[PDB]
């Protein structure tokens, strides 16, 4: 992901491997809600989808 | 200023009827109606009125000698048979920033058989695809539209 | 009434009529300084003390009928009581605010007006954009900018009189009554405040801070324009950076470019010339920079460059002791130094007649990349020191202070010929062609010129002579710091001769400036430029010879019409027009005058179609061979550095338009003019009662009737003669001009006739 | 007197004039529909469907 | 040289009856032309 302070007009990237545990309060409601429903999936940085 | 005083000023202490040219430009008109101009003026050949703030050309007299007849950066819109018939030898038109919805609102200039050339800018009818073709069988008698001839060639004097 | 019964109370006293029959009022701001209270030393222990009172705040006796005695809550607004010294009573801040809250109310609609400065910096402020910060090491170099931006750049007595003019119209003192350029800004101010209630006293200050100048000397890192120093606490720090653009408007002028240009081509067409000194002066006496005479604006703009300084030299004023070489101001600051000549063989077998300076003298050199300083021996470089942005400044900074130098060292290390010549195929002086060869080429130099190590230490490091940096070894006495170096503190302007060449020579013998150093490059004039000088188009070319033509037809237009009226031909054969017909081919002139002149008989013999524009337009055309013709012409050839160039009849053309709803006149874009009319009935009576053109006849006088107020002067018939009030305080008896002329051109005849006796 | 090219099908019968209506023919330059929210919203779904 | 320097076609529909330019016509070559005072008709 992308994120951007347009107050300090500066820019940065995360990685999917630390999106198991960060906080939601960057994201807006959609997906916040997303990774919500997606949270007990993460392994290792990799969703499980049978 | 207003008109009367415009024409007063323009016409030099002199009567109305050894003039060839007048240049209404910058003036207002009450009611947006045309004033002043009367039947006296029978040898005017060169007129221009510019930001004169008229609705309509509806008390335009009858200048047979009319020629080179300018409507420019105004809000003129209606009906044109007025000027189809008060004025039928006019030669040179223009009327570039007019408000003018469309074709069937400038089809009576077709009567004026002596048009030259006629001007359109910045207005809505220019905005119809086709618009040059579609005038000029409006108006065959025409020769140069918006200063170019059917071929998109410039039109010297 | 009040004002004239309070004089007859102080007049009744002997001593308040002493003092008032015997100073006079040029002496009068001298009494104003006799003032026998007492300053209060710290201000802000007063005003604490001042606030806990019940009545600190002194209003006017007025207040009484509009603010009652008390308010709702009974608390008491205004006092029964008077100030030491006058009669202004006390009241509270309440009274304030109550006014505030319950006054009557008025629309502010000149306040916007009245302070644009402000309201600018508001605006500016609004529209700006901002970027990251940065932190890291700052160097901010010390040098003199800008404060208000705005402002008309005009001279202190200039925004005097104009707000003299503005807002006190019945009061202007003589010089504006004998004055003849009502300026356009005067009149639009005039309008703008037509009805201003605001305090008359701060529309004139408010006036004087918008129109005037201002610069101060401060430490800067980044941009210098006006508006870029203004918010110089928000955008430079001491570790930090802030990126932020001011949204308003720039307001860039390009006259100094003009100057430049101007002052460049005097002197290089008076150099050949037989009496530079005299040519120079009635050249610059005579012309005119954007409607303005150059003699002003060479006396306001503090303009720094060889022609220029050399202007002022023959025209007699201060310049400083100083030189620009190689593109950087330099300035001696210790030791002195003897010039001698000398003759010098270079490594090209090429002899060079030199001056050198023996002594051991030290300078301080500040270019537009770089800042260096250099301690020179008699013919040794001791010690040199650069600080630049870039290499090529470092370079460039370092070839100039070596070329400076002269030493002998150099002198063997030269290879190639040094042969350049300026683009006017005048031979160079020696040093300069050296400059010129270094540039192109130092390699073999720095390769034969010194090698030699040196201690390291913080703040400074050494250079390789392939130009990188280097702490174990450098070259003989060069030098590079990693900050900043300040440049020169202040300047020294001194008296100095200059001789019938353009040399400048400083009282010791030695020269100081020569034409030779001048920059032979060549640029364009953003404002037209005129002149009524001699044969001096050599630069001009066609494209603003054109607009020079049609300038000076204009400027003469009431002559060239009268002899238009009544003798044509004289008028044809005037000389000035030789360089248009230069321009119109060889093969056709005689056509085109033939047509011009036929058309002018035409015009003439019909009457009630005066048509100034079309004279105008055609006029030059008709200075050749009236060769007859007979095909009606409608566009005639002008030759504009080989392109033919048509001019039209009958309507504007490129390269002549004239707009009459301006009713203004420009040749090829370029600037020209404007035409002297209003009304369709060829009078200019129509103004806005422009009160200028007046003439006094001495002392009051009783006969002509009782004094008038300058407003009401407007009345007055064509040559009639009365008696207005001017200054402060002084009837004269004034009468209007008969005589459309000015003072502008007295002494001129008997100038010319007096130098012709000396000489 | 506007031009209008779907008025064409009021006499061309559409499957004839089918071609007008693939605008681009091409790959387009923007990519879009890969990244990470994307396969957020595939995962949640796969596991909605199957509730 | 003498005559008006070289023109271009289209402006040439400015020039009076009679008049004489320099219009280059084409490729690197100059060619003067004189505007012809009659008119020729066609059916």
């Known amino acids: ?50 | 200023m207003e008109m009367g005083r415009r024409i007063h000023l323009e016409l030099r202490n002199r009567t109305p009827s050894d003039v060839k040219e007048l240049v209404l430009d910058n003036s207002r008109s009450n009611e947006g109606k045309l004033e002043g101009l009367t039947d006296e003026f029978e040898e005017l050949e060169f007129l221009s009125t510019i930001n004169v703030g008229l609705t309509s050309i509806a008390n335009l007299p009858k200048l047979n000698k009319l020629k080179k007849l300018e409507l420019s950066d105004n809000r003129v819109s209606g009906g044109l048979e007025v000027l189809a018939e008060k004025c039928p030898n006019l030669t040179h038109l223009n009327l570039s920033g007019n408000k003018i919805k469309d074709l069937s609102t400038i089809e009576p200039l077709k009567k004026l058989e002596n048009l030259k050339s006629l001007d359109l800018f910045n207005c809505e009818v220019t905005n119809l695809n086709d618009y040059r073709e579609n005038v000029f069988k409006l108006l065959p008698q025409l020769t140069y539209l918006d200063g170019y001839d059917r071929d998109d060639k410039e039109a010297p004097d | ?759 | 007197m506007d031009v209008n090219p779907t008025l064409l099908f009021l006499k061309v019968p559409v499957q004839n004039a089918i071609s007008t209506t693939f605008p681009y023919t091409g790959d387009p330059p923007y990519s879009h529909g890969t990244g990470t929210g994307y396969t957020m919203d595939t995962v949640n779904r796969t596991h909605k469907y199957s509730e």
């Open chain 1, 1 to 50: 992901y992308m994120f951007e302070s347009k107050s300090m007009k500066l820019r940065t990237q995360v990685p999917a491997e630390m999106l198991a545990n960060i906080d939601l309060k960057y994201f807006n409601k959609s997906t916040r809600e997303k990774i919500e429903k997606i949270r007990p999936l993460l392994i290792d940085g990799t969703a499980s989808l049978s």
């Open chain 3, 1 to 759: 009434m009040e004002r004239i019964k309070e004089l007859r109370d102080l007049m009744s006293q002997s001593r308040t009529r002493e003092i008032l029959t015997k100073t006079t009022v040029d002496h009068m701001a001298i009494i104003k300084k006799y003032t026998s209270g007492r300053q209060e030393k710290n201000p802000a222990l007063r005003m604490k003390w001042m606030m806990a009172m019940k009545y600190p705040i002194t209003a006017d006796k007025r207040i009484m009928e509009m603010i009652p005695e008390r308010n709702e809550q009974r608390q008491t607004l205004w006092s029964k009581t008077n100030d030491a010294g006058s009669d202004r009573v006390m009241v509270s801040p309440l009274a304030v605010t109550w006014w505030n809250r319950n006054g009557p109310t008025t629309s502010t609609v000149h306040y916007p007006k009245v302070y644009k400065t402000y309201f600018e910096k508001v605006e500016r402020l609004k529209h700006g954009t901002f970027g990251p910060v940065h932190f890291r090491n700052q160097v901010k170099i010390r040098r003199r900018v800008d404060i208000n931006p705005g402002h008309a750049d005009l001279s202190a007595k200039e925004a005097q009189d104009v707000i003299m003019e503005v807002v006190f119209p019945n009061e202007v003192g003589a010089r504006i009554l004998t004055s003849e350029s009502q300026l356009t800004i005067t009149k639009e101010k005039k309008k703008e405040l037509q009805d201003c209630k605001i305090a008359p006293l701060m529309v004139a200050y408010m006036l004087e801070r918008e129109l005037v100048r201002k610069t101060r000397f401060l430490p800067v890192a980044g941009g210098t324009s006006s508006v870029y120093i203004e918010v110089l606490h928000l955008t430079q720090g001491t570790c930090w950076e802030q990126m932020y653009t001011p949204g308003g408007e720039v307001r860039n002028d390009d006259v100094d470019q003009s100057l430049i240009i101007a002052a460049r081509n005097i002197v290089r067409r008076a150099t050949v010339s037989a009496d530079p000194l005299a040519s120079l002066l009635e050249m610059c006496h005579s012309t005119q920079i954007g409607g303005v005479r150059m003699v002003d604006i060479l006396r306001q703009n503090p303009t720094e460059e060889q022609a220029v300084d050399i202007c002022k030299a023959a025209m007699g004023l201060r310049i400083s002791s100083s030189f620009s070489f190689g593109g950087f101001t330099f300035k001696r600051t210790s030791g002195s130094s003897v010039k001698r000549e000398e003759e010098v063989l270079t490594g090209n077998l090429q002899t060079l007649k030199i001056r050198v300076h023996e002594g051991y003298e030290e300078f301080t050199m500040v270019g537009r990349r770089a800042t260096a300083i250099l301690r020179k021996a008699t013919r040794r470089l001791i010690q040199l020191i650069v600080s630049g942005k870039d290499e090529q400044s470092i370079a460039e900074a370092i070839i100039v202070a070596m070329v400076f130098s002269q030493e002998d060292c150099m002198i063997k290390a030269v290879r190639g010929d040094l042969n350049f010549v300026n683009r006017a195929n005048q031979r160079l002086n020696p040093m300069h062609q050296l400059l010129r060869h270094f540039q192109k080429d130092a390699k073999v130099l720095f390769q034969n010129w010194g090698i030699e190590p040196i201690d390291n230490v913080m703040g400074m490091i050494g250079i390789l002579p392939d130009m990188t940096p280097s702490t174990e070894m450098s070259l003989r006495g060069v030098r590079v710091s990693k900050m900043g170096v300040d440049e020169y503190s202040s300047t020294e302007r001194v008296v100095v001769s200059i001789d019938r060449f353009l040399r400048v020579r400083d009282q010791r013998g030695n020269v100081l400036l020569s034409p030779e150093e001048v920059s032979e490059t060549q640029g364009t004039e953003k404002l037209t430029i005129t002149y009524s000088s001699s044969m001096m188009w050599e630069i001009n070319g066609p494209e603003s010879v054109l607009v020079n033509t049609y300038q000076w037809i204009i400027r003469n237009w009431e002559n060239v019409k009268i002899q238009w009226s009544q003798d044509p031909t004289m008028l044809y054969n005037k000389m000035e027009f030789e360089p248009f017909q230069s321009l119109v081919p060889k093969a056709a002139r005689g056509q085109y005058s033939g047509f011009v002149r036929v058309l002018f008989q035409q015009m003439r013999d019909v009457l009630g179609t005066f048509d100034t524009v079309q004279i105008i337009k055609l006029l030059p055309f008709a200075a050749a061979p009236p060769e007859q013709s007979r095909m009606q012409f409608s566009s005639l050839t002008v030759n504009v550095r080989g392109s033919g160039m048509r001019i039209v009849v009958r309507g504007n053309s490129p390269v002549f338009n004239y707009n009459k709803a301006t009713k203004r006149l420009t040749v090829l874009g370029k600037d020209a003019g404007a035409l002297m009319e209003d009304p369709d009935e060829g009078t200019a009576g129509v103004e806005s009662a422009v009160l200028r053109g007046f003439l006094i006849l001495g002392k009051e006088n009783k006969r002509y009737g009782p004094a008038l107020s300058i407003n009401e002067l407007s009345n007055l018939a064509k040559g009639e003669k009365a008696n207005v009030l001017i200054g402060q305080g002084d009837v004269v008896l004034v009468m209007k001009r008969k005589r459309d002329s000015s003072i502008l051109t007295d002494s001129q005849t008997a100038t010319k006739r007096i130098r012709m006796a000396i000489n």
